[PDB]
Amino acid sequence: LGEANSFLEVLEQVSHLAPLDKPVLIIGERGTGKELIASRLHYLSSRWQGPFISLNCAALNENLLDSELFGHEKRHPGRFERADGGTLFLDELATAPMMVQEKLLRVIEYGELERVGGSQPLQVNVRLVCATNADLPAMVNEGTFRADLLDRLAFDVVQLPPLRERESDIMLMAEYFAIQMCREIKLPLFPGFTERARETLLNYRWPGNIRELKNVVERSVYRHGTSDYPLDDIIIDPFKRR
Numbered sequence: 001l002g003e004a005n006s007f008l009e010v011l012e013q014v015s016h017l018a019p020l021d022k023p024v025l026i027i028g029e030r031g032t033g034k035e036l037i038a039s040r041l042h043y044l045s046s047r048w049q050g051p052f053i054s055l056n057c058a059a060l061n062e063n064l065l066d067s068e069l070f071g072h073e074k075r076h077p078g079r080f081e082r083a084d085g086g087t088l089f090l091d092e093l094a095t096a097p098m099m100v101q102e103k104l105l106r107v108i109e110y111g112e113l114e115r116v117g118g119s120q121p122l123q124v125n126v127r128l129v130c131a132t133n134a135d136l137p138a139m140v141n142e143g144t145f146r147a148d149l150l151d152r153l154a155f156d157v158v159q160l161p162p163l164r165e166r167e168s169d170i171m172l173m174a175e176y177f178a179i180q181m182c183r184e185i186k187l188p189l190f191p192g193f194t195e196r197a198r199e200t201l202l203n204y205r206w207p208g209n210i211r212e213l214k215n216v217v218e219r220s221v222y223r224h225g226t227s228d229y230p231l232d233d234i235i236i237d238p239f240k241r242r
Contacts, residue, residue, distance in 0.1 A: 001033070001169075001173060001176075001210065002166060002169040002172065002173060002210075003168070003169065003172065004161070004166035004168050004169045006161040006165065006166060007160075007161060007166060007169065010037070010158060010159075010160060010161070011040075013156075013158055014037060014040055014041060014044065014158065015044060017041065017156060017158070018040070018041045018042075018043075018044035018045045019044070019045055019046060020045075020155075021127055022127075022155040022156070023108065023127070023128040023129070023130070023152070023153050023154075023155050024041060024128075024129045024130075024155065024156060024157075024158060025093075025129075025130050025131070025132075025153050025154045025155075025156070025157045025158070026038065026129065026130070026131040026132075026157075026158045026159075026160060027131070027132060027133060027157060027158070027159045027160065028131065028133060028159070028160030028162070029133050029160070029162045029207070029208075029209050030133070030207070030208055030209060030211070031163075031206075031208040031209035031210050031211030031212055031213075032160040032161075032162060032163070032209045032210065033160065033210060034091060034131040034160060035054060035089060035091065035131075037158060037160065038052075038054070038087070038089040038129040038131065039052060039089075041087065041127075041129055042086065042087040042089075042127075042129075045087070045127065047085065047086050047087055047127055050083075050084075050085040050086025050087070051082060051083055051084075051085065051086035051087075052083075052086055052087050052089070053079050053082045053083040053086065053087070053088045053089070054088075054089040054090075054091065055068060055069065055079045055088070055089070055090055055091070056091045056092050057090055057091065057092045057093055057095050057096045057100075058091070058092035058095040059092075062097045062099065062100070065096065065097070065100055066099065066100055066103070069090075069100065069103075069104070070103060070107075070113050070114075071113065071122075073115075073116075073117060073119065078113070080107060080113060080124045080126055081113070081122060081124060083124075083126045084124050084125055084126060085125060085126075086126065086127070087126065087127045087128070087129060088126045088127070088128055088129070089129045089130070089131070090128070090129070090130045090131070091130075091131045091132075092131070092132060093130040093131060093132045093134075093136075093153075094132045094133075094134035094136065094139060094144075094145065098144070098145075098146065101145065101146045101149050102146060102149075104149065105146065105148055105149045105152060107124065107126075108128065108149075108152055108153070109152070111123065111124060111125065112124060128153070130153055136150050136154075137150070162206065162209055163206040163209045163210060163213060164204075164205050164206050167202055170201055170202055170206075170213070171193075171198065171201065171202070173210065173213055173214075174193065174201055174213060174217050175190070175193075177213065177214045177217040177218060178190045178193075178217050178220075178221050178231070181217065181218045181221040181222065182221060182227075184218075185221070185222060185225070187221075187225075187226070187227045188227050189227045190221075190227070190231075191226070191227045191228070191229060191230045191231060192230040192231065193230060193231055193234075194230045194231065194232040196232055197220075197230075197231055197232055197233070197234050200234040200236065201234055204236055216234060216235060216236055217234075219235045219238060220233060220234050220235045223235055223242075
């Protein structure tokens with residue numbers, strides 16, 4: 001979400017990339033909306049009526065990631081199969097082991113999964129979107145990411161700006177989230193943010209970006225719990241005994 005110029009530029013970029021069949025790499029921090037951008041690419045493409053499938057590479061160990069992406073065998077179809085005719089979004093790409101990476105490059109270059117057991121190779125037709133916040137070029141240098149894979153995945157790159165670089169959007173989205181929380185708890189009006197609250201909001205780095213902002217603001221509104229005076233206490237850390 002948001003209206004900072006750097007974010008509008010991302011939306012404009014997405015509008016031009018979506019119609020292509022080429023892979024897209026999204027670089028962004030947690031809570032910047034990577035999967036929502038991936039979804040947007042899908043729905044603005046010619047594949048929009050096909051499936052949108054997502055997988056977080058970081059969540060699974062090596063053998064389970066391999067099975068989940070490429071399938072195993074009557075059969076457990078993998079995510080490439082499930083995304084046939086549509087788009088597959090792979091999050092936390094940097095965590096894919098080197099074996100998975102080489103297999104993925106093959107799927108990209110040849111357009112088919114390999115198969116054992118008398119079964120013919122499975123043909124797939126999938127538009128790929130990946131995301132990470134790693135420095136992939138730095139990983140190539142270290143030997144932890146495949147140069148050949150990154151020589152192909154990154155047809156183009158969509159860089160999502162962290163919230164701390166979109167200070168205009170911080171107060172805009174904070175207001176939006178505060179209003180929704182007021183509705184949820186049945187306060188008549190959002191009474192505003194004090195200048196001390198605004199300083200707290202604008203000074204904080206938001207490592208968790210929009211997701212974190214929404215959480216902080218919702219909690220803060222709930223703890224404040226009144227429309228009679230402006231919200232002064234922004235509860236960044238729920239573990240503090242405030």
